[PDB]
Design a protein around this nucleic acid. Sequence first.
RNA 1: UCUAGUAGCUGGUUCCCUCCGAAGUUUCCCUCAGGAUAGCUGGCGCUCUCGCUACGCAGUUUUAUCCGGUAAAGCGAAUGAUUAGAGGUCUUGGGGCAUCUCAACCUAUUCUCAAACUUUAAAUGGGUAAGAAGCCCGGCUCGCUGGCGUGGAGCCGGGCGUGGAAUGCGAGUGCCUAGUGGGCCACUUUUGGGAAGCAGAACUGGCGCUGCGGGAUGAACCGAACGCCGGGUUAAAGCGC
RNA 2: GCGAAGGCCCGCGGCGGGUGUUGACGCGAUGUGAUUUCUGCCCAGUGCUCUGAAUGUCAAAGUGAAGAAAUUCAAUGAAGCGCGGGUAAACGGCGGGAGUAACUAUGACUCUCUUAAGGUAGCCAAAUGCCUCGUCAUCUAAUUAGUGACGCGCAUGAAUG
RNA 3: ACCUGUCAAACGGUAACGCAGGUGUCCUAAGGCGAGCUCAGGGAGGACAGAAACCUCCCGUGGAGCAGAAGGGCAAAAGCUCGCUUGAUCUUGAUUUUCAGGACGAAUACAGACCGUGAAAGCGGGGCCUCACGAUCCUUCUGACCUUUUUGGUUUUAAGCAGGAGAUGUCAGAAAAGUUACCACAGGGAUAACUGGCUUGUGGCGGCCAAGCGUUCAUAGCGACGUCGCUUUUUGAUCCUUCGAUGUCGGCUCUUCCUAUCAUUGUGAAGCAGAAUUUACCAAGCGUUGGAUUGUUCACCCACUAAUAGGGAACGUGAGC
RNA 4: GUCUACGGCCAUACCACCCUGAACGCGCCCGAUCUCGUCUGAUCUCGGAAGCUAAGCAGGGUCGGGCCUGGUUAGUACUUGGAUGGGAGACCGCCUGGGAAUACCGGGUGCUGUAGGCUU
RNA 5: AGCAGAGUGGCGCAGCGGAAGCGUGCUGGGCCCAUAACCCAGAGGUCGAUGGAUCGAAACCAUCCUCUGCUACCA
RNA 6: UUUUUUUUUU
Lengths: 208, 103, 159
Amino acid sequence: GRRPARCYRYCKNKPYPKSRFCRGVPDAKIRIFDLGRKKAKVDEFPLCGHMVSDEYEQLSSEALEAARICANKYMVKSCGKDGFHIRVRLHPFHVIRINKMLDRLQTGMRGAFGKPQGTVARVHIGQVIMSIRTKLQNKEHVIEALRRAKFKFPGRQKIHISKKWGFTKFNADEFEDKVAAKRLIPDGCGVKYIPERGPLDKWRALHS
Amino acid sequence: VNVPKTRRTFCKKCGKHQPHKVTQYKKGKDSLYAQGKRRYDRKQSGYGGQTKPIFRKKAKTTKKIVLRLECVEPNCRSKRMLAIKRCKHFELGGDKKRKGQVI
Amino acid sequence: TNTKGKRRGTRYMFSRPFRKHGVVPLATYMRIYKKGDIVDIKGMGTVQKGMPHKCYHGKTGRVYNVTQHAVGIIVNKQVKGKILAKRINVRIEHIKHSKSRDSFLKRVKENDQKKKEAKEKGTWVQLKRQPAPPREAHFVRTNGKEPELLEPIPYEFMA
RNA sequence: UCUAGUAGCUGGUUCCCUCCGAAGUUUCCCUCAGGAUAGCUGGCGCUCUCGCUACGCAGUUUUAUCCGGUAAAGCGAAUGAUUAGAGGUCUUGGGGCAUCUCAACCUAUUCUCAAACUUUAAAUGGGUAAGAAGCCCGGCUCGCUGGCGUGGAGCCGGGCGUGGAAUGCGAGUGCCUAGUGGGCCACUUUUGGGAAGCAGAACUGGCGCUGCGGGAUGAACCGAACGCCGGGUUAAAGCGC
RNA sequence: GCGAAGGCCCGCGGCGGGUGUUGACGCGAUGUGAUUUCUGCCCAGUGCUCUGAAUGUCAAAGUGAAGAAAUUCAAUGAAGCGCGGGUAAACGGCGGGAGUAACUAUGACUCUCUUAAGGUAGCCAAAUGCCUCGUCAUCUAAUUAGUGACGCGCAUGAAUG
RNA sequence: ACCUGUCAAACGGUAACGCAGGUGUCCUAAGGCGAGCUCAGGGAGGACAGAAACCUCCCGUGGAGCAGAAGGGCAAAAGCUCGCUUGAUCUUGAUUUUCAGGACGAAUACAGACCGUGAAAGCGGGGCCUCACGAUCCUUCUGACCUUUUUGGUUUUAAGCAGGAGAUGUCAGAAAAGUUACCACAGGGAUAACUGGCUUGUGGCGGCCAAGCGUUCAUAGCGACGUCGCUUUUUGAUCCUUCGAUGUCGGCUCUUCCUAUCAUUGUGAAGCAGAAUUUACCAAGCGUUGGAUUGUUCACCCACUAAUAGGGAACGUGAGC
RNA sequence: GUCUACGGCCAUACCACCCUGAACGCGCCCGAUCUCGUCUGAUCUCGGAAGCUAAGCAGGGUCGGGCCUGGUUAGUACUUGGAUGGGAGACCGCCUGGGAAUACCGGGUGCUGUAGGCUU
RNA sequence: AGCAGAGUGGCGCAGCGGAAGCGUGCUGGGCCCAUAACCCAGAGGUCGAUGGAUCGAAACCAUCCUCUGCUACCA
RNA sequence: UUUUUUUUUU
Ligand SMILES: [Zn+2]
């Protein structure tokens, strides 16, 4: 029912998103992007690992769904069902088309503009595909889970352990000091950054 | 469209703006003694058959509306022909629309 | 093929700049254009009358006629291998004075006065412009401070 | 016999050397195997210019000065699209049961996006200017304009050559004019298509019109373009036979 | 269709020719195709054909009126069309949609629409059936073939016999 | 024949039966001018009144409206409400857009008249801007104390001059139904119906990962979600070759070649006790049948067999039938 | 140091809230006979001068939002030109030149023209 | 383009100088215990309209929109 | 002018 993924791989068209100009788009195969214990705080999942793309290609929504499932299945078995948090950092927004599957119809290349077939995500070199945050002792399991999810993707991917704290944008070596100095206020899965560039009442509330 | 039955426009004979009566121009009947009709009749007589085209690929659905303006000055009573754009419905001296009416 | 419409593809060139919509500033109507001066054509979408065609936007010409609200301009237009001097009428809002001519008129003034000063002082002064010459020889002092040694940095794979 | 009927279609179209040398593109056409039209070509000139016993121009740069919304970037900026937690609460909300959790809304954050989105915004682009047709003084005309000796334009005298960036080059102009109006290929950009030695575009170069050295061979690649020769040296590519 | 001053037809032309040395048991024009047994319903459509005209439209010529005339206007105004008739062994056509009989499934009796009638008697995967090498039986060891049956038959069917 | 955004590679221009759309109109006002107001939405209040009746305050950069599609533009606006009007009128040239720098359509600044509006400056010769349309010949109306009407004169008539209108949508504008299997001619490989060539979507054949299946056990044997290939025994896509001709389906006959191996020789593995079977390796030497139905390739059945494997050679093979 | 009338450039000028405002002015303010217009003298128009800076308005303030400007991002992204560079490709590196934009971090918060006043 | 017509309880029609109907369609009632239509009864018509005439009009007259039949055809 | 049916042995 679906063409081999080699037919849609090389980002040969301009972005073709779902809009008022492109209607009738089938829903993407991947609808859940955050998995595991999403409600965990910053301080409990300090280690972060990324699956980084090493090619300029487009990855299908089916591939993203397959990789997410197999990465989740391994990390549940190895780290428990509440010992990690997986975030898929790719959303399928590009729509790929297909020409008609072939008396009353005009055959050939006449009127050959296609109909929507599926959705793929355009990824650049050095761009993160998936991220997993966990405790510092589950480094080997994070590498293994991302390694198995590589086989679901066409091109080449590299597994990288981040220098930042969890899913935040702040370095893990400075994170605790910033929290103690009240520069970083935890909120939910992430953190808030507090500058010295506002009304002094906010500073009063923080230090009260 | 709705065009009022009277309008104040320039009069070429009077040299100035005058009230005019507005009517709808209608094509007069063929003369039967115009030179083109005489020539066509001479060509059409005999055994040749139809000698000139008969138009059949009609495309226009409306017609340009031509207004006949007649000066109301009794000594002048001059006329002019003033065409407006195509319209499907044309009304002369219809009621004027108002905005406070209940729909 | 595409249309021959007059404002096709002027979506951005005739739009007003960001946070610069509204009333046209009044000094644009107060600029005075004489016969023979050079003006830049830049269509403004706020005024739809006397609007130059898109092919004259960004073009520069000289005034040959002055009317109550508009100006006639002799503008060069390239047409399929020949350049012809078109005459176009543009309202005042879509034009402004060209600063290239003003700079040259200033240089003529300082040249003529420098000739008069040179003749009265019995000296010779340079009046022709010259291209940037090669840099002259000079000394560079170290001030007893050794140059800092630079070195390529090791590669690091970031996120 | 009219009749050598007409054919935008196929075939053919006869000596030599010399010089110059294309087009398959624009617009109109019952126009799409054809024409007319502009373009590209040639021929005939002509008007001038420099120099010895410069009139001006330019597929270039520079110096000034404008024009732009593509690449990029952005979404804790507008329009759209979109993931996840967090903190509060009016709740024409719901559920389990004095209620309490969800949902809704708000606020501050967060993940990911746009050919027909954008605050911002290149590189390469396009226009103009770089003086004697200039500059500066004095006067005259006007029915236009007008508080005015106003303003604007025109006209008549006079003065000023350090010729007002670099580089290169001799220019201007008239008539007549054939062939062509099936194209094709390549770097980069680019639309449709899974794709194609597929179809369709932009810029430049090329093949067609062109042989020569190299790629064993080859329309287009790399090098280099050609009167008949001798010497020397190279390019691209090579140097076991 | 035609009783001869005619029907059908020939001919550039002649009250010229053929049928016709003929006269309805004849000549001319069509369709179906022995015998047997039958030949259902539809005249709305297209043709052909009849006269009631309530009679509308309706050229030339003729008539009247105005003007100086050319001209113009008015009344009158044949056939044909219109209008009402026949007619399918003329060309042809012959549906659905409902309302419903004690397991079902099937389902007469009632009413409606287009453009009149809704396919009767018979016959059939036929030289006519796409699906289809239809289903059952018989024929063989084995049969997309043959035969006999079956009936919602793409698209059978009554002198298009 | 036209218009909007994009394509389109930041001047302009730029193609495809590219993408998303609109047009053959509509308006005496929705044309023109002036004045006075502020719109969408939201919050908080008020008898019936409630999610939506009307009244009031507050916030509101336009998130509304401006008739048509879209883009741009616009706030004491170009939007809403009133008041007065006909600059949507009469003329001559110049210019822009498409462009050959012919035309038409549309549009821009002027100039001369006559007017509208407002206290006035001003603004207005149609629609806020970019679409909404049409030659010659012929006809028809309108204008002048107009010109001709042929020996002269008067009067009808006719002709002419200038501006509108009746239309050509194949929209630079012939007056136009079919069939040919009885066919004809000039041509075309500028162009279809075979082979071949590019491509491989589809067909066919493989591989990787491992969620599960297999009593137990991911991998004896399989293999979901995904993903990478190969082949040209399928069918498409394309139109490079051949239309002054490359004889065309199938069968029959005959040779050779390939291996992606059905059997047979030699082996490895098993959920291999034996028998039977399955998986894999070297491997194409040898063999791969007789018939009913069908023109058939294909299919199906009957029966033997060690097995009754799959293919190519111009979809081998018509001066072989 | 300031204001008023008319403006130019149109936020360094806007927005939210707080403080201060001498003198002239600008206002708020009082009233409806006339001019004028309303459901309503609220607005608009007209005639004033008892009171008040509460408001508008001006100046200042806020680890204020916005705005302007500069760093950083960063010689990164992108890009003119080049090669018989690499790579199966996707794409990438180098030579020759040009060269950005968020987040993040600082500084600033109207200048001014003509005419006429006050600060005596 | 020319002539001649017509629009009616919703219908098939009938008259010209006002009194609006008939078999049908809605409704209520007689008669019988029959399932009737005759029988009586009511409602339902701006008679498609703009103006003109006259003491008065679907009805008469001029035009529009809703058609009909026939005739006619150089942009 | 019409008016069909009506039930199982007991
Ligand atoms: Zn007059």
